[PDB]
Amino acid sequence: VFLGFLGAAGSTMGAASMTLTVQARNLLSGIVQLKLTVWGIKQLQARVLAVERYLRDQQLLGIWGCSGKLICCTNVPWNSSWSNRNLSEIWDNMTWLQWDKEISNYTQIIYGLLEESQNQQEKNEQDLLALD
Amino acid sequence: VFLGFLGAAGSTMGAASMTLTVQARNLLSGIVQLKLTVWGIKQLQARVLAVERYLRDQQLLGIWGCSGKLICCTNVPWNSSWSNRNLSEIWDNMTWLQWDKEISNYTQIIYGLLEESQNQQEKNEQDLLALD
Amino acid sequence: VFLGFLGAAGSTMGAASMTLTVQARNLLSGIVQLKLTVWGIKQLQARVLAVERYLRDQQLLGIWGCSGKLICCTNVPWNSSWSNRNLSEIWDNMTWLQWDKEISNYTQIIYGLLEESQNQQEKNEQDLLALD
Amino acid sequence: NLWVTVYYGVPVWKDAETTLFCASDAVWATHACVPTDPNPQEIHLENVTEEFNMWKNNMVEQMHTDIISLWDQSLKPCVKLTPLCVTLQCTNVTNNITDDMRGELKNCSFNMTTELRDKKQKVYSLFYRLDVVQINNKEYRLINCNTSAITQACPKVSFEPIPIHYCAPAGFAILKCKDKKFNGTGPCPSVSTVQCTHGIKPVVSTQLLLNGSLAEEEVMIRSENITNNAKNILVQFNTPVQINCTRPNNNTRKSIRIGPGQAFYATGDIIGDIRQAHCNVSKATWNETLGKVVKQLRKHFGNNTIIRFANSSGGDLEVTTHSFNCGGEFFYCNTSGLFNSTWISNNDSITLPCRIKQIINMWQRIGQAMYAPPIQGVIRCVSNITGLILTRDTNSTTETFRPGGGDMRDNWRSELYKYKVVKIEPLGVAPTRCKRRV
Amino acid sequence: EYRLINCNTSAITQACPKVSFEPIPIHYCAPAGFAILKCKDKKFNGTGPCPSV
Ligand SMILES: *[C@@H]1O[C@H](CO)[C@@H](O[C@@H]2O[C@H](CO)[C@@H](O[C@@H]3O[C@H](CO)[C@@H](O)[C@H](O)[C@@H]3O)[C@H](O)[C@H]2NC(C)=O)[C@H](O)[C@H]1NC(C)=O
Ligand SMILES: *[C@@H]1O[C@H](CO)[C@@H](O[C@@H]2O[C@H](CO)[C@@H](O[C@@H]3O[C@H](CO)[C@@H](O)[C@H](O)[C@@H]3O)[C@H](O)[C@H]2NC(C)=O)[C@H](O)[C@H]1NC(C)=O
Ligand SMILES: *[C@@H]1O[C@H](CO)[C@@H](O[C@@H]2O[C@H](CO)[C@@H](O[C@@H]3O[C@H](CO)[C@@H](O)[C@H](O)[C@@H]3O)[C@H](O)[C@H]2NC(C)=O)[C@H](O)[C@H]1NC(C)=O
Ligand SMILES: *[C@@H]1O[C@H](CO)[C@@H](O[C@@H]2O[C@H](CO)[C@@H](O[C@@H]3O[C@H](CO)[C@@H](O)[C@H](O)[C@@H]3O)[C@H](O)[C@H]2NC(C)=O)[C@H](O)[C@H]1NC(C)=O
Ligand SMILES: *[C@@H]1O[C@H](CO)[C@@H](O[C@@H]2O[C@H](CO)[C@@H](O[C@@H]3O[C@H](CO)[C@@H](O)[C@H](O)[C@@H]3O)[C@H](O)[C@H]2NC(C)=O)[C@H](O)[C@H]1NC(C)=O
Ligand SMILES: *[C@@H]1O[C@H](CO)[C@@H](O[C@@H]2O[C@H](CO)[C@@H](O[C@@H]3O[C@H](CO)[C@@H](O)[C@H](O)[C@@H]3O)[C@H](O)[C@H]2NC(C)=O)[C@H](O)[C@H]1NC(C)=O
Ligand SMILES: *[C@@H]1O[C@H](CO)[C@@H](O[C@@H]2O[C@H](CO)[C@@H](O[C@@H]3O[C@H](CO)[C@@H](O)[C@H](O)[C@@H]3O)[C@H](O)[C@H]2NC(C)=O)[C@H](O)[C@H]1NC(C)=O
Ligand SMILES: *[C@@H]1O[C@H](CO)[C@@H](O[C@@H]2O[C@H](CO)[C@@H](O)[C@H](O)[C@H]2NC(C)=O)[C@H](O)[C@H]1NC(C)=O
Ligand SMILES: *[C@@H]1O[C@H](CO)[C@@H](O[C@@H]2O[C@H](CO)[C@@H](O)[C@H](O)[C@H]2NC(C)=O)[C@H](O)[C@H]1NC(C)=O
Ligand SMILES: *[C@@H]1O[C@H](CO)[C@@H](O[C@@H]2O[C@H](CO)[C@@H](O)[C@H](O)[C@H]2NC(C)=O)[C@H](O)[C@H]1NC(C)=O
Ligand SMILES: *[C@@H]1O[C@H](CO)[C@@H](O[C@@H]2O[C@H](CO)[C@@H](O)[C@H](O)[C@H]2NC(C)=O)[C@H](O)[C@H]1NC(C)=O
Ligand SMILES: *[C@@H]1O[C@H](CO)[C@@H](O[C@@H]2O[C@H](CO)[C@@H](O)[C@H](O)[C@H]2NC(C)=O)[C@H](O)[C@H]1NC(C)=O
Ligand SMILES: *[C@@H]1O[C@H](CO)[C@@H](O[C@@H]2O[C@H](CO)[C@@H](O)[C@H](O)[C@H]2NC(C)=O)[C@H](O)[C@H]1NC(C)=O
Ligand SMILES: *[C@@H]1O[C@H](CO)[C@@H](O[C@@H]2O[C@H](CO)[C@@H](O)[C@H](O)[C@H]2NC(C)=O)[C@H](O)[C@H]1NC(C)=O
Ligand SMILES: *[C@@H]1O[C@H](CO)[C@@H](O[C@@H]2O[C@H](CO)[C@@H](O)[C@H](O)[C@H]2NC(C)=O)[C@H](O)[C@H]1NC(C)=O
Ligand SMILES: *[C@@H]1O[C@H](CO)[C@@H](O[C@@H]2O[C@H](CO)[C@@H](O)[C@H](O)[C@H]2NC(C)=O)[C@H](O)[C@H]1NC(C)=O
Ligand SMILES: *[C@@H]1O[C@H](CO)[C@@H](O)[C@H](O)[C@H]1NC(C)=O
Ligand SMILES: *[C@@H]1O[C@H](CO)[C@@H](O)[C@H](O)[C@H]1NC(C)=O
Ligand SMILES: *[C@@H]1O[C@H](CO)[C@@H](O)[C@H](O)[C@H]1NC(C)=O
Ligand SMILES: *[C@@H]1O[C@H](CO)[C@@H](O)[C@H](O)[C@H]1NC(C)=O
Ligand SMILES: *[C@@H]1O[C@H](CO)[C@@H](O)[C@H](O)[C@H]1NC(C)=O
Ligand SMILES: *[C@@H]1O[C@H](CO)[C@@H](O)[C@H](O)[C@H]1NC(C)=O
Ligand SMILES: *[C@@H]1O[C@H](CO)[C@@H](O)[C@H](O)[C@H]1NC(C)=O
C-alpha cells in the first residue's frame, strides 16, 4: 500500500523497511525546474547542496560493496557493546528514530569496519580464486 | 563499426541496440572546460542541468535492480494492452522513435511495476534464503 | 595500518593497492561547508568542478562492467607492445607514477577495448543464455 | 510470453528549450566564451526525418536578449555624458559655396564644465542636425535629453560582428537539416546533427540583410503566412550582392577633457572631399537578382499577376531608411534607389544617399541612448547583401512590396532556421522474451 | 593656487573609516581531486627535484 513520503516514519524498523523506496526517490527528488536577484543564487546553492548531500553518502555505499542498496548484508559481526538488545526488542519494538538515539554513539566506529574489513578481504581472495 | 553519436538513430530498435554506448558517453559528455557577464551564469546553469538531467534517471536504474545498464531483464510480465504487436512487428520493423510514439502512453504505468514488484519481492526472499 | 591520504604513494604498485580506499574517500571529499564577493563564485565553481571531475571517470567504470571498483578484472588480453615487462619487473619493482610514465602512451588505445569488447559481447550472450 | 525489459541510451528525443551557451575562436563583447573545437563534428542521420518550425524556434529569443545584455554590459564601465545636456549656441557651416552639402552640421559652442569643477570653458564641436534640435545664432539641444541620459561608447571597444557558435549542454542535441528546400516549417527528408552551430555574425541591420549565409538551388521565400499581409517575407539570396559604402571625410577628433578625469571625444574639423556619404551598388546585378526573386513570387501568387517594388510607408527614420553599422559609424541610407521597379504579368551602378547619426537607439529600446564617438579619418567599407526583409502591401493582379524590419529577432531567425534543439531521453522499455533468474 | 594630484588622472574615493588594512593570515585550499603538495627540503634553488616531499 502506498503510504506517501515518510509514511512509515511512525512505525517499527521492521515495518518501515517495507517502503524504503517511497522515501528514497525524494532524497534527491529532482525536477524543481535583471540578473542575480534574491533566490537567484539561492535556488542555485540549494539545488547544488542537494546533489552533494546525496552523493556524499551514496559513495560510501559504493565503497561498502553493495550498490544494490536500501538493504544488504556484510561479513562484519555485531559487537555486543553496541546496545545489547534482542531482535524482538529491536526490530519489533522500536522506530528508526529511537534506534539512532542509541546507536548514533558508535557511528564512526562501526563505519570503520564497514569502510574496511570485508572490502579489504573479500578481494585478494578472489584474485587468488582466479589463479585457476 | 563506429557510426558516431546517434549514428544508429535511423534504424530498427534491434539494430540500434548494437551501439547504445556510443550514445551513452555523450549523454553526460563532460569536458566542456569583469565578473558575471553574459554566459557567466549560463554555462554555469547549463552544465549543472546536465548533471541533474543525467542522475535523475540514473537513480531510477539504480532503484530498478540493474545498474549494469544499457540493457537488463526484469521479472515483470508485459501487459498485452500496452500495444499488442509481435516481436518481428516490433524489433525487426520499428525505430525507437516510432516505439515511443505508442508506448509513451503507459510510461508512468509501467514505471509503477518497475519501481516496485521485483525490487520488493526479490528481497525478503533472499533474506529468507540466508536463514541457513 | 592507516597511513593517511596518499600514504602509500611512495611504494610499489602491489603495496599501494593495499590502501586504495584511504585515497578514494578524498577524491570527492565532500563536507567543505554584500553578495557575490571574491570567493563567492570561486568556492562555487571549484566545488562543482570536483563533482564533475569525479563522475566523468566514475561513469567510465560504470560502462566498464565493474562498478564494484578500486579493482576488477576484464576479458581483454594485454597486448605485449604495451611495455613488455614481467610481473616482478612491474608490480614488485615499480610505483604507480613510474607506471604511468610509460603506459600513458596507450591510454586511449586501451580504453577503446575497455569501453567495448566485453561490454558488447558479455551481453547478447546472456540474452541467449536466457533462452531457456 | 513477453516481459518488461529495461533499456538505456535509447536514441530518442523531445522538442524542448534549454539554456544555450556560446563558443568562438580564442572587439565587440566576446572574450568570456569557450573556444571552439578544432574539429567540429557532424553526422548525417539516414532514415531520420521530422518537422522543423522556424517560427516557434526559441533559440532566436535567447540569442536576441543575450546580445542586448552584452550591449549594456559593454557600456556600463564607460563614460557617461550627462553634463553634455546644455543649451547650444549654433550657426551654419559655410561649405563650399553655394550649397550642395546643405550644411548638415552646425558649429555649436557652449559653456562646458571641465575637470576644474568651478571655472568653466567655452568650447565647440560639430554636430549633425539629426542629433540636435532647436530650443523654442540660435539655441539647440541634444535630442536625447528629452528622453533619457546618454553614455559615450568607449573608444577602445569596437562593434565588429564576430562569428558566434551556439552549443547545447549534455542531454540536448543540435539538429540540422541539410535539405536545400524548406518552406519555413515541415518534415525534412535529409536531417543531420552537429555538436554546435556554424559561426553566426551578430549583424544589426534593417531592410537589407548583410554578411549572412547563402541559399542553395533557387531564391528562398519564407513567411509565417504568405497570404496574410499583416506578416512579412524573408528572402534569402543565392549570390552575394556587393555593396560598397563610403564616408569621404578626413575629419579630426578634438577630444575635450570634460572630467574630472573622464574624457569626451568631440568632433574636430571636417576636411577633404566634402561629399555626402553614399553607397555604390552594381545595378545590373541588382536587376538580375531581383528578377530571380520575382520568379519565386510568381510561383506563390500566379502566372498572371503584376509585381511592383516601392519604398517604405515612412515615419521613424530608423524604420524608413536602411540602418547599419560600419566601423562604429551609423548609416541611414535612402533605399528608394533600389526598391523602385516593376514586373509585368508573365557600369551601370546605383548611388544611395546616406546620412550619419551620432545619437542612436538600439532595438527599438527607449529609456536609454548611446553616443557614437566620431571615427577619425575617411571611413569606407564593403559587404555582401544576402537577403531582404519585405512586407506585403482591388486585389486581383497588381501587388506592391516594400522593405521593413524593426524587430531584430527577424535577423537572428533568418539564420537559426537551420537549427533546432531537442532533449534526449536515454531511458526506455520494450517487450522482450526474457524471464530474469536469481 | 593648488590642485589634488589625482584630478588630472582619475577620480578618487575615500576609504571607509571603519574598514582596516591589517594583513590577515589566509589559507588556500584545493577542491577534491586536487592536492596541495609541499616540499620540506630546507634547500631549494627555486626549481628542481625535492628529496623530501
Ligand atoms: C502507530 O502506533 C500504533 C500504536 O500506538 C500502532 O498500532 C497498531 O496498529 C495495528 C493496526 O491497527 C494493530 O495491528 C493489528 O492488531 C491485531 C491484534 O494484535 C491483529 O489481529 C492484526 O493482524 C493487526 O496486527 C496493532 O495491534 C496496533 N498496536 C497496538 C499497540 O494497538 C500502529 O501500528 C502504529 N503505526 C506505525 C506506522 O507504526
Ligand atoms: C535506412 O533505411 C533503409 C531502408 O529505407 C535500410 O535499408 C536496408 O539497408 C541494408 C543495407 O544496405 C539492406 O540489408 C542488406 O540486404 C540484403 C538483402 O536483403 C542482404 O543480402 C544483406 O545481408 C543486408 O541485410 C536492407 O535490405 C535495406 N532494406 C531495404 C528496405 O532495402 C537501412 O538499413 C536503414 N538504416 C538504418 C540505420 O536503419
Ligand atoms: C620507501 O623506499 C624504501 C627503499 O628506498 C623501501 O624500503 C623497504 O622498507 C621495508 C621496510 O623497512 C624493507 O622490508 C623489510 O625487509 C626485510 C629484509 O628484506 C624483511 O625481512 C622484512 O620482512 C621487510 O620486507 C625493505 O627491505 C626496504 N627495501 C630496501 C631496498 O631496503 C620502503 O618500502 C619504501 N616505502 C614505500 C611506501 O614504498
Ligand atoms: C557662457 O556663454 C554664454 C553665452 O552662450 C555667456 O552669456 C553671457 O552671460 C552674461 C552673464 O549672464 C551676460 O552678460 C550680461 O549681459 C547684460 C546685457 O548684455 C549686461 O547688462 C550685463 O552687464 C552682463 O554683461 C551676457 O549678455 C551673456 N551673453 C549672451 C549671448 O546672452 C556667458 O558669459 C558664457 N560664460 C563664459 C565663462 O564665457
Ligand atoms: C567654429 O566655432 C569656433 C569657436 O567655437 C571658431 O573658432 C575659431 O577658429 C579659428 C580657427 O581655428 C580661430 O582663429 C585663429 O585664432 C588665432 C588667435 O585668435 C589667430 O592667431 C588666427 O589668425 C585665427 O584667427 C579662432 O580664434 C577660434 N575662436 C575661438 C573662440 O577659439 C571657428 O571659427 C568656428 N567656425 C565657423 C565656420 O564659424
Ligand atoms: C493567414 O493569416 C490570414 C490573416 O492573418 C488568415 O486570413 C483569415 O482567413 C479567414 C478565412 O478566409 C477569414 O475569416 C473569415 O472572415 C470573414 C470576415 O471577417 C468572416 O465573415 C468569416 O466568418 C471568417 O472569419 C479572415 O478574415 C482572414 N483574415 C484576414 C486578415 O483577411 C488565414 O487564416 C491565415 N492562415 C493560417 C494558416 O492561419
Ligand atoms: C517613398 O517614396 C514616395 C514616392 O514614391 C514618397 O511619397 C510621398 O509620401 C508623402 C507621405 O505620404 C507625401 O507627403 C504628403 O503629401 C501631401 C501632398 O503633397 C502633403 O499634404 C503632406 O503634408 C505630405 O507631404 C508625398 O506627397 C508623397 N510623394 C508623392 C510623389 O506622392 C515617400 O515620401 C517616400 N519615402 C521615403 C522615405 O523617402
Ligand atoms: C567491542 O567493542 C568494544 C569497544 O566499543 C571493545 O571494548 C574493549 O573491550 C576490552 C574487554 O573488555 C577492553 O580491554 C578494552 O579496553 C575495551 N575498549 C574500550 C574502548 O573500552 C571490545 O573489544 C569489542 N569487541 C570486539 C570483538 O572487537
Ligand atoms: C493490463 O492493464 C490494463 C490497463 O492498462 C488492465 O485493464 C483492466 O482490464 C480489466 C479487464 O478488461 C478491466 O476490468 C479493468 O477495468 C481494466 N482497467 C482499465 C484501466 O481499463 C488489465 O487488468 C491489465 N492486466 C494485468 C494482468 O494486470
Ligand atoms: C598490439 O597492438 C599493436 C599496436 O599497438 C599492433 O601492432 C600492429 O602489429 C602488426 C604486426 O607487427 C603490424 O602489421 C601493424 O601495422 C601494427 N600496428 C601499428 C599501429 O604499428 C598489434 O597488432 C597488436 N596486437 C593485438 C593482438 O591486437
Ligand atoms: C542657415 O542656412 C539655412 C539654409 O541653409 C537658412 O535656412 C532658412 O531658415 C529659415 C528659418 O527656418 C527659413 O525661413 C528659410 O526658408 C531657410 N532657407 C532655406 C534655404 O531653407 C538659415 O536662415 C541660415 N541661418 C543663418 C543665420 O543665416
Ligand atoms: C521629446 O522631444 C521630442 C523631440 O526630440 C519630441 O518629439 C516630437 O513629438 C511630437 C509628438 O510625437 C511630434 O509632433 C514631433 O515631430 C516630434 N519631434 C521629432 C524631432 O520627432 C517630444 O514631443 C518631446 N517630449 C517632450 C515631453 O517635450
Ligand atoms: C561575399 O560572399 C561570397 C560568396 O558568394 C564570398 O566568396 C568567397 O570569396 C573568397 C574570395 O574570392 C573565396 O576565398 C571564397 O572561396 C568565396 N566563397 C565561395 C562560396 O565561393 C565572399 O567572401 C563574401 N564577402 C563577404 C565580405 O563576406
Ligand atoms: C506557371 O507556368 C509555368 C510554365 O510557364 C509552369 O511551369 C512548370 O513548373 C513546374 C514546376 O517548376 C514544372 O514541373 C514544369 O515542368 C514547368 N513547366 C514548364 C513548361 O517548364 C508552372 O506550373 C505554372 N504555374 C501554374 C500555377 O500553373
Ligand atoms: C523610380 O525609378 C524610375 C526608373 O526605374 C525613375 O524613372 C524616371 O522617372 C522620371 C519621371 O517620369 C523620368 O524623368 C526619368 O527619365 C525616368 N527614368 C527612366 C530610367 O525612365 C524614377 O525617377 C524613380 N523614382 C525615384 C523616387 O527615384
Ligand atoms: C597630469 O598631471 C601630472 C602631475 O600631477 C603631470 O605629470 C608631469 O608629467 C610630466 C611628463 O611625464 C613630467 O615632466 C612632470 O614632472 C610630471 N609631474 C609630476 C608631478 O610628476 C602630467 O603632465 C599631467 N597630465 C596632463 C594632461 O596635464
Ligand atoms: C533477550 O530477550 C530474552 C527473551 O527473548 C530475554 O530473556 C533477555 O532478558 C533479553 N535480553 C536482555 C538484555 O534482557
Ligand atoms: C552517547 O555518549 C554520549 C557521551 O559520549 C552521551 O552524552 C550520551 O548519553 C550517549 N548515549 C547513549 C545512548 O548512552
Ligand atoms: C502476430 O504475428 C503473426 C505472424 O507472426 C500474425 O499471424 C498475427 O497477425 C500477428 N499479430 C497481429 C496483432 O496481427
Ligand atoms: C495516447 O493517449 C492519448 C490520450 O490519453 C491520445 O491523445 C493519443 O492518441 C494516444 N496514443 C496512442 C498510440 O493511442
Ligand atoms: C622476464 O623476466 C625473466 C625473469 O623472470 C627474464 O628472464 C626476462 O629477461 C624478463 N623479460 C625481459 C624483457 O627481459
Ligand atoms: C610516448 O610517445 C611519445 C610520442 O608519441 C614520446 O614523446 C614519449 O617518449 C613516449 N613514451 C614512451 C615511454 O616511449
Ligand atoms: C531588368 O532587366 C529586365 C530583363 O531581364 C528588364 O525587363 C528591365 O527593364 C531591366 N531593368 C533595368 C533597369 O534595365
Numbering used by the authors:
A (entry chain E), B (entry chain B), C (entry chain F): 518 to 550, 566 to 664
D (entry chain A): 33 to 58, 68 to 141, 150 to 185, 188 to 309, 312 to 321, 321A, 322 to 398, 411 to 457, ...
E (entry chain D): 190 to 242
Copy text from the publication.
Here, we identify the naive antibody precursor of BF520.1, describe the subsequent evolution of this antibody lineage, and explore the structural basis for HIV binding for the first and currently only infant-derived HIV-specific bnAb that has been described.
Single-particle cryo-electron microscopy was used to gain insight into the interaction of BF520.1 Fab and BG505.SOSIP.664 trimer, which is a clade A transmitted envelope variant from a Kenyan infant who was in the same cohort as BF520. The positioning of the CDRH loops in our structural model indicates that they make multiple contacts with both protein and N-linked glycans. The CDRH1 loop is in close proximity to the base of the gp120 V3-loop, with N32 oriented towards the conserved GDIR sequence, consistent with increased neutralization observed when asparagine is introduced at position 32 on the CDRH1 loop (Y32N substitution). Adjacent residues of CDRH1, as well as the CDRH2 loop are located proximal to the N301 glycan. The relative orientation of the CDRH3 loop suggests it may interact with the V3 GDIR sequence, as well as the N332 glycan, though given variability in CDRH3 positioning between homology models, the contacts are less certain for this loop. Based upon the BF520.1 homology model, N28, A30, and Y31, which were implicated in nAb breadth, are positioned directly adjacent to the N332 glycan, although we cannot unambiguously identify the position of specific residues. The position of CDRL3 loop suggests it likely does not interact with the BG505 trimer or key glycans, which may explain why it does not contain mutations that contribute to BF520.1 breadth. In contrast, the slight rotation of BF520.1 relative to PGT128 places the CDRL1 loop in closer proximity to the N332 glycan.
